[PDB]
Amino acid sequence: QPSLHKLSIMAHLARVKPHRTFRFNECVCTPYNADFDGDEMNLHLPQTEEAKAEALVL
Amino acid sequence: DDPVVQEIDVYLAKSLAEKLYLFQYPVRPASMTYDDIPHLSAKIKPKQQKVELEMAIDTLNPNYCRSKGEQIALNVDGACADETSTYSSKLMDKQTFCSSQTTSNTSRYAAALYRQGELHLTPLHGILQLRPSFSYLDKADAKHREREAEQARQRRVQSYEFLQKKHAEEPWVHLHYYGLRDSRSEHERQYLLCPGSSGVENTELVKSPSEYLMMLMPPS
Amino acid sequence: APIPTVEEKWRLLPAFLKVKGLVKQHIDSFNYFINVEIKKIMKANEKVTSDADPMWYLKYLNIYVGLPDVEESFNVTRPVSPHECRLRDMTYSAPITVDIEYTRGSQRIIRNALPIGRMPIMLRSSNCVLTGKTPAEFAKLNECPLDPGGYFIVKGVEKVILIQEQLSKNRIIVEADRKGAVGASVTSSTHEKKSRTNMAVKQGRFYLRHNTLSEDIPIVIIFKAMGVESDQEIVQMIGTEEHVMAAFGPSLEECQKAQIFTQMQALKYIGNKVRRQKTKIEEARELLASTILTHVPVKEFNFRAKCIYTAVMVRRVILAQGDNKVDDRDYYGNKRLELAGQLLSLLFEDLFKKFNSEMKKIADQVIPKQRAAQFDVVKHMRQDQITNGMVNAISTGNWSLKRFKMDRQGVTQVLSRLSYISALGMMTRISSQFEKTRKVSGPRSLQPSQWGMLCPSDTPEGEACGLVKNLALMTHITTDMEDGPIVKLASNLGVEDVNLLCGEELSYPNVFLVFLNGNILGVIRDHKKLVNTFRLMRRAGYINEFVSISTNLTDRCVYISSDGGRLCRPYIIVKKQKPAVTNKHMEELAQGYRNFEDFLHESLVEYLDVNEENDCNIALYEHTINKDTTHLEIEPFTLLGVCAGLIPYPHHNQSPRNTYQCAMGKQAMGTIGYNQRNRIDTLMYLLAYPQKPMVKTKTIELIEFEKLPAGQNATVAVMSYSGYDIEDALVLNKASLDRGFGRCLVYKNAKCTLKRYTNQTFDK
Amino acid sequence: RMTVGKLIELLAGKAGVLDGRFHYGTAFGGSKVKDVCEDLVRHGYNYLGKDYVTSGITGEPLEAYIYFGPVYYQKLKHMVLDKMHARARGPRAVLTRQP
Amino acid sequence: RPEVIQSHSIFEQGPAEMMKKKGNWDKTVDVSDMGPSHIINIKKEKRETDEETKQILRMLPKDVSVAELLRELSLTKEEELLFLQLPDTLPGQPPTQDIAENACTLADLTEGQVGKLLIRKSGRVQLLLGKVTLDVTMGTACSFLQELVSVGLGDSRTGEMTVLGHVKHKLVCSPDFESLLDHKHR
Amino acid sequence: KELSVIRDHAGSACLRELDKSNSPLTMALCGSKGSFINISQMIACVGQQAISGSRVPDGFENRSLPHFEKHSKLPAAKGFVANSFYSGLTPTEFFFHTMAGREGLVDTAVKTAETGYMQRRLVKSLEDLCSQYDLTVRSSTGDIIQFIYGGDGLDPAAMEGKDEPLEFKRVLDN
Amino acid sequence: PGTQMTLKTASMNITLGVPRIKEIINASKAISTPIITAQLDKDDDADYARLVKGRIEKTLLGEISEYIEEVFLPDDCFILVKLSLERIRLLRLEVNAETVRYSICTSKLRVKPGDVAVHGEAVVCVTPRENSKSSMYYVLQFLKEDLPKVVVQGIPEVSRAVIHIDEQSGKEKYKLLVEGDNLRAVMATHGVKGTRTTSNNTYEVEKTLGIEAARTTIINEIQYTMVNHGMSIDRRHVMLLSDLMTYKGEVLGITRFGLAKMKESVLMLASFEKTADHLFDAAY
């Protein structure tokens, strides 16, 4: 949520899994400055094919 | 240690118990006494003590400026009235001291005329500060301003006009001043002494240390 | 040879917690309110007088509060427990009965109990139904024995009046200006007035500023306005050194530019400057004797004692521009803490004056008009004004008193019941004065004046880091004193009056002023004799033991403070390198032949204030005592607060970790109390199988955390396992989770009201 | 973070459960390390809490010793079942037609 | 004004500066030995420190009580006026004065010997006023004029005003709380 | 200077006696978490506790706490700690350490309102700029800011060297 | 990298961190602690250093005058000031009594050149006149405190200076850190190499050495502040920031006034502040 540089928001390819938490690889903790101590991270699902493609490429 | 020196007996006098005052001049040092200056008049009220003096300043001394004295005497009084006036002559001769009262209770201060191994206390009836007054500039501006041109519950005791009216009702008393150098000061200075024997046991001041500590520090 | 240690000196702390500290601060303020201050407000407003038709009056004789009650539908009343008030969503209140005397033609008509309103009773105070009871009798009231109390109950929610922090009023503060100037000010507050006067040096000439005056006026005009007209006496009161006169010169040279030489002329000069709310002279004389520097009294319009005080202000400005030893707003000798009593005093005073004014308005309308038969005012006591005022001001959180110009918002918070430490921690907060204006970083830092008064570790993390603070374990906030015998003891100890001298004695090197809460009592030589004799009269019990006396050897002032709301702290007196507490004394304490008050009266323990401990030399342990010690620290672990008392070995961690633990310990799921099953709250988390800690602090044994704990002992390996534990994450055990580890219950609430309307129709 | 207090809490709790005491971790005092080391060595554990530990996955023992002990964990109120939230489309404001 | 001012390496002689400075203001027009030009030696203007009044001329430490009484006794046999402050209550009874343990001032005492001033060895001055010992300390020393006057209203409308002498020093008497508490502790 | 010598020599003495396969030493050598300052600070000697780049300012009249003599400038009385985190701080050292820690906490509390407003101004001023196809950087109206982006025309996101597009020695060894 | 700066750091305290970047991009005309770094040609000796140091450091008349006195004579009254020429000789100044004559009559109550005499090589008298504008002839007290606060030698804007030394073994030269905000004067004194001296305050370099030197000053100063905190920014970013500030010939801020001069927009400025006056004036 506190978005300092432009890598505070990136696009991942989602995969569904049973438990109730967003689970990303820990090598990506340095761009978000996440720390896994109860931190929350927002999700945004684009609704248009142009938005998917611009998210995936850029 | 033993009190090897000065077993000074402290005596008490009451002849001047209601007469004795202490004047202090906040603006005049120790060396500059008033023993030489001629005193003209002394005004007083006994209850609500407010002493007013008038001292005369000479004119032929070099410290007096007549070029300003003529002008300020013309500014204060009328040029040729001479019936009522703050100054008799055409020059500023008199200097008025007005007092302000320091404390209400003066029961806890006493003068002490020390002598050859003995000490004579005497209670004071009042301590006053005598400051030189600037009433003449206000009378000058008064003469200048006249030359140009089922009620609700009230509170008068805590205002200024009623307090001046309450103090104005007590009549003045005029006094014959006597200097330090006169024989009358030496005549009345022996009223600070008290005729008594050398050693007389006091029938008063008998209360114990514990009674004294209880007495000055009362229980709530 | 080592100094022999009193090893059982620790017991002075559980004996101290029986009486003072650990929410008993709030309770001892509210008892002070409902036992003296409501009578003092009633004495300040004892008689109303209708304007039309005089010699008809209402005269309040005495006031009371009494035990709590409840009003029901069929005019029946019954005493109530607090828990019934929590469940039924009402307010736990007691009715204010006042006895009046008044006139109905018959000149003496008396009543003995006329109820006019309902005071909310704070729990475990003198009027509450809980105090003095045994743990067998809290069961019949459904109340926990460990519930600390000190929180109100209004409309079913539990509200706590937070301890407000203020700057100490009626004291000379030398601060810097924005543009580089140095000016002094004093927020002169009494019970009837609050206004800030100033002193500005904006050209090298001393201007005084005030909210009343339209434009700032020079200071020598004011000195001439206050009955001293000679310039020599002014410069005597300022000071007789050379550079003081050199700095004050252009202010004298200003007053000779205008023709201000007489007091009437100066009052005329001021009378043109007054914002007009006899017009010229009286509006300036009453202004000088009532509003500028209003905390200094004027007896019979004798302005001498106010001239000396404003000369002291100008002398401090001059000596402060020479070397920049300005005072700081952050020293906790200059703070005062306003408890629940000193807000309920203001609230009840404003509501009671609006009550008397509304009654006088109704009486003024109805007496000359309707009928010749004399009415009674007993038919005109609408209780809803007092009740709705008290309840709305507690339950809402804003204290808009237009009489006192106070518009504080967010005084009361809902008492957080996440666990036991959360309740006990919110009962000891101190909310700061600024309340997040901007990032000043001046009062947010930890000043060293908070030693043993406030907690170094416990502060919130976030936007409020450093403003909200927490009281320590072994502190005590004073109440207001009688003010009487301090003056009479001070006059016997050689304090010459200020009226018996000119200002030249103020600038001597051997002459110290004395103050008393901002008013000059006089001057004195040999201040060490005064201070030591005053302390020996304090330790013998002739003076109330919270009266502190300090000495400021730079500014040459001997302060004697007696106002309430400042932080005190007990110590053990040390007389010539030996503690005054001997092992026989702690043995008598452990057997019960004496208690902590008998340690106070035998000159063994005395309460230092922050201002008094500025001059004392305190040793922490027994082996630190050298020849210049006066006081010994009772227990050094009372430096830390309550929530920092949960931490085991807190002096081994890096200090941010203690602050993060003080934040997280208020959120731990635990047990609220023994009544936690009979208790319907908004959101209540319980732990299924709590356990008491395995490494426990003495603070845990004092506040009884081990009787209802929050957390479970877990067998913790410290190893790296499977890489799912990278940034602070931790791996649990599935079998431990299945057998009961960390099992927690969540209780929620769902309420529905079925109201009856103004029409005779009902919800169903 | 230099939380050496956790490393002493683990040790003193381990030395406390083995003989039924509660050790004090009082600020500026409390039971030192030198006492709980001897209290552990009297019961047959190592004097520093590190234990020979066998891995459950492979069955083979581990190269470094592992530091066991009972530490007082406490569950905080921030649970994920109250914080997980989603919105596809739902109620909008009446005035500014946005969620 | 010429701006390009010139300078040289030579060193200024000390006496040459001294004698130039001397010649700049040692000139005097005091030849006018006349009335206006004359000046009264006892009415010089007041320099501000009142002990230090003399700025123009024809050309301090603080004493203690035993030093003051030693000077007033041995150094001069001339009598001297002191001004002493007493505590609020003196350890006595008002004799048949219609009482309640009020204040006991000097106005409720009689004439005669009322106490003994004991100067001890090494500065300690006690005022034994009975069984109890008051303590005497030097108060804030005044430097301005204090005249000790008498006012006698012998007639209803007029009276006599007489100065007895100048008051120079001030004493303060204060109780000994250490001794009063060490008699019986509380 | 003398207290920095005490801390640095205590650190250089505590690091020499640690064994290899010590866990803080491995975690400091591989740079994963920690450093040598932390190992020295929790074995040997916690250093001077500096508030705003100086020693502890006096919070009382000419002394830091009441537990020291007036006008002393000793090392223990103005903030220096001798104990490690292993042997545990004494109460005065603990209070000085908490004074030094709340500065870090309050700086992190200030940092949001200190830096977000500056970045909001920089965004609103700079966001219109774009790199056109003729390799000029023009504003919203079309005035030229730069004729070529940064002189060379190169992206900072693709710099293999120290602010230079290649490092030729590494490419030749490749 | 403003988020990574913990405001971390023998004399000449400089502000670093987020407030220094904020002072740079605000482009305010007066900044807290400007420092002019000056270079000396004859960089060998401290005797050469302290000469020009005294030539640029502000020295007060009271700091060299051993006594300043008011003398009343029967025929005249004046203010005699004796200069301590031993301390002038040791501080190595180009002043004498005639220089102190010229430094006075510079904006002090309209004093005349005839009102000052040069009686010796060490003494100066000042005979005051009536001000005739809300003052009295006893203005000698104003002159008796104001006259030590006049400056006879040095730059009127420079508060203080300090000699700074290098450390390398091959050489030893003395640079001169000057804490003042008048770059034009420091560059023009004899003995200071004007072709190699810089500043911190960007507006002074804009006023003195042009807009392009202001651009280079902004580049070097932002990169200096970023390097002192261990963060690294590629130079193209601060280069574009410096070119955005100076593409209209004058150094502009990132505040709302400079943003009003760069951006023509109405709704952009109406989002920022100023409740409705922009909208009603833009309608007007």
Next chain:
Amino acid sequence: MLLFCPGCGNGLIVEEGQRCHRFSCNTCPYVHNITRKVTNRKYPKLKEVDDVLGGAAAWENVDSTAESCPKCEHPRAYFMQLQTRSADEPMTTFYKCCNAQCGHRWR
């Protein structure tokens, strides 16, 4: 300097009369003829000389038959006396020796 009237205690001003310059009150007739030289010296604080003398300054106080310095017992040293504050201070004595393979600072 402030000087005040013995009569009323207002502040005096200097003016000129027909034979002398006078101190005169503004509100009462008191005047005081300035018959002789009267003065008031400020004596302000001079600059610090500690870094001014270091590094081979233009000292001159050395004289024939001057004492040798006490450590080296050679006359290869300068010595000086200066006021450090205003010229009412009694001058302090200080000396520094600079010789081959020998650097020291003394008082």
